[PDB]
Scaffold this active site. Structure first.
Site, short mmCIF file in Angstrom:
data_model
loop_
_atom_site.label_atom_id
_atom_site.label_comp_id
_atom_site.label_asym_id
_atom_site.label_seq_id
_atom_site.Cartn_x
_atom_site.Cartn_y
_atom_site.Cartn_z
N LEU A 20 0.84 -1.23 0.00
CA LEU A 20 0.00 0.00 0.00
C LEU A 20 0.85 1.25 0.00
CD1 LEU A 20 -2.74 -1.23 2.49
CD2 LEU A 20 -3.06 -0.74 0.06
N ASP A 79 1.00 14.38 15.49
CA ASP A 79 1.26 14.25 14.04
C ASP A 79 -0.05 14.30 13.28
OD1 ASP A 79 3.12 13.93 11.82
OD2 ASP A 79 2.79 11.75 11.84
N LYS A 96 9.70 6.45 6.00
CA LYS A 96 11.01 6.31 6.69
C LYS A 96 10.91 5.18 7.72
N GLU A 134 6.73 0.02 6.04
CA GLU A 134 6.04 -0.33 4.79
C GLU A 134 4.73 -0.99 5.21
OE1 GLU A 134 8.82 -2.76 2.42
OE2 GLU A 134 9.66 -0.87 1.69
O1 LIG Z 1 0.24 3.60 10.74
C1 LIG Z 1 -0.95 3.25 11.14
O2 LIG Z 1 -1.31 3.41 12.30
C2 LIG Z 1 -1.93 2.84 10.09
C3 LIG Z 1 -3.04 2.11 10.50
C4 LIG Z 1 -3.96 1.63 9.58
C5 LIG Z 1 -3.79 1.87 8.22
C6 LIG Z 1 -2.67 2.57 7.79
C7 LIG Z 1 -1.76 3.06 8.72
O3 LIG Z 1 -0.74 3.89 8.36
C8 LIG Z 1 -0.05 3.63 7.13
C9 LIG Z 1 -0.57 4.58 6.11
O4 LIG Z 1 -0.54 3.94 4.85
C10 LIG Z 1 -1.67 4.23 4.03
C11 LIG Z 1 -1.99 3.01 3.21
N1 LIG Z 1 -3.41 2.89 2.93
C12 LIG Z 1 -4.28 2.23 3.73
C13 LIG Z 1 -5.47 1.66 3.20
C14 LIG Z 1 -6.34 1.11 4.08
N2 LIG Z 1 -6.03 1.12 5.41
N3 LIG Z 1 -6.77 0.57 6.43
C15 LIG Z 1 -6.04 0.78 7.52
C16 LIG Z 1 -4.83 1.45 7.25
C17 LIG Z 1 -4.86 1.66 5.85
N4 LIG Z 1 -3.94 2.18 5.02
#
Ligand SMILES: O=C(O)c1ccc2cc1OCCOCCNc1ccn3ncc-2c3n1
Length: 331
Positions: free
Chosen positions: A43, A154, A47, A50
């Site tokens: 996705l 953040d 830094k 992933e």
């Molecule tokens: O770091 C966390 O706490 C975090 C928790 C949940 C998700 C992403 C996160 O952060 C990474 C960001 O990346 C974006 C990728 N796109 C998607 C698509 C669908 N979802 N569903 C949950 C998350 C998600 N991320």
């Protein structure tokens, strides 16, 4: 040196807690079984990690796995502890599991899947009502985490997942969040440049929950004015200049005086002298449908130099900007 400061609200919430709640250095991590999850597609990357869509093979549920890039044990424990403390709270992302990644011996966080609508593409479609509604939803997450003794530190669009079809919002990426303790000197090298509060930019370490409210104000300005980012600095120094050209230099220097802050000398010949601008210079034919007296009054009360004078999350939720949304939710 600098004058000390305390949060106006939720000041002592962690002092009343058992030590274990906030003493994340001592936390013992409950691991799960990596073989329960299979990675489906990548996705994104940063830094720090992933992120993959994945599937839990034991129940065929979609989940998201964040593979951590090497950081201190303490930093991983802090994010885990905060996610566990906040789990179930309004619009907080749910941490489902923690696994040890066999490839690198690296930990992986497993989250609930949110069907997120395109963040860059979403903004282009948002109405006045939508902005009020989603702002209210973010405020519910912030009041909750603040009430639980945690500052996010953040807040920005990337960290707000929106499933638009379901009018569902989650505040994500608790990797920079910290527990509030009165008197604690925090690291100012946090957050994204465009969202950094004046306290960070002038190196005032005894900050609190109110940092999140500055970041939120930056988001609101960017949404109602169709200007992303709103405060577009070239670096941390120029970021304060950009703020000063809008909020004015008189109030900046008043803040510095009140807290006896020692201003980096690099500022001295770059801040200059600026009037406080009226918000109306940012209104134009393409954004006016998003802008009201209410919106501007609310924004004005978030974007203050003095962290103590900004609205709290709970005060913000009571602002006239939200009266229609509050009524709609009761029905
Ligand atoms: O770091 C966390 O706490 C975090 C928790 C949940 C998700 C992403 C996160 O952060 C990474 C960001 O990346 C974006 C990728 N796109 C998607 C698509 C669908 N979802 N569903 C949950 C998350 C998600 N991320």
């Amino acid at each position: 040196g600098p004058v000390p400061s305390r949060a106006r609200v939720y000041t002592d919430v962690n002092t009343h807690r058992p030590r274990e709640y906030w003493d994340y250095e001592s936390h013992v991590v409950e691991w799960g079984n990596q073989d329960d999850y299979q990675l489906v597609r990548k996705l994104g990357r940063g830094k720090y990690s992933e992120v993959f869509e994945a599937i839990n093979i034991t129940n065929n549920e979609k989940v998201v796995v964040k593979i951590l890039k090497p950081v201190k044990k303490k930093k991983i424990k802090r994010e885990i502890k905060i996610l566990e403390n906040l789990r179930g709270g309004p619009n907080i992302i749910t941490l489902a599991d923690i696994v040890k990644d066999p490839v690198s011996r690296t930990p992986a966080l497993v989250f609930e899947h949110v069907n997120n609508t395109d963040f860059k593409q979403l903004y282009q479609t948002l109405t006045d009502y939508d902005i009020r509604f989603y702002m209210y939803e973010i405020l519910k997450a912030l009041d909750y985490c603040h009430s639980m003794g945690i500052m996010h530190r953040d807040v920005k669009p990337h960290n707000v997942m929106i499933d638009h079809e379901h009018r569902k919002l989650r505040l994500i990426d608790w990797g920079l969040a910290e527990f509030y303790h009165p008197g604690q000197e925090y690291n100012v090298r946090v957050a994204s440049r465009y969202f950094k509060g004046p306290e960070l930019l002038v190196d005032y370490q005894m900050y609190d929950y109110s940092l999140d409210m500055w970041s939120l104000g930056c988001m609101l300005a960017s949404m109602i004015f169709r200007k992303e980012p709103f405060f577009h600095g070239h670096d941390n120094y120029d970021q304060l200049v950009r703020i000063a050209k809008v909020l004015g230099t008189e109030d900046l220097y008043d803040y510095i005086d009140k807290y006896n802050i020692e201003l980096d000398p690099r500022f001295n010949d770059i801040l200059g002298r600026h009037s406080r601008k009226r918000w109306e210079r940012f209104v134009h034919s393409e954004n006016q449908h998003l802008v009201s007296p209410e919106a501007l009054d609310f924004l004005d009360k978030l974007l203050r130099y003095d962290h103590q004078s900004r609205l709290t999350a709970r005060e913000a939720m009571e602002h006239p900007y939200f009266y229609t949304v509050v009524k709609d939710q009761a029905r």
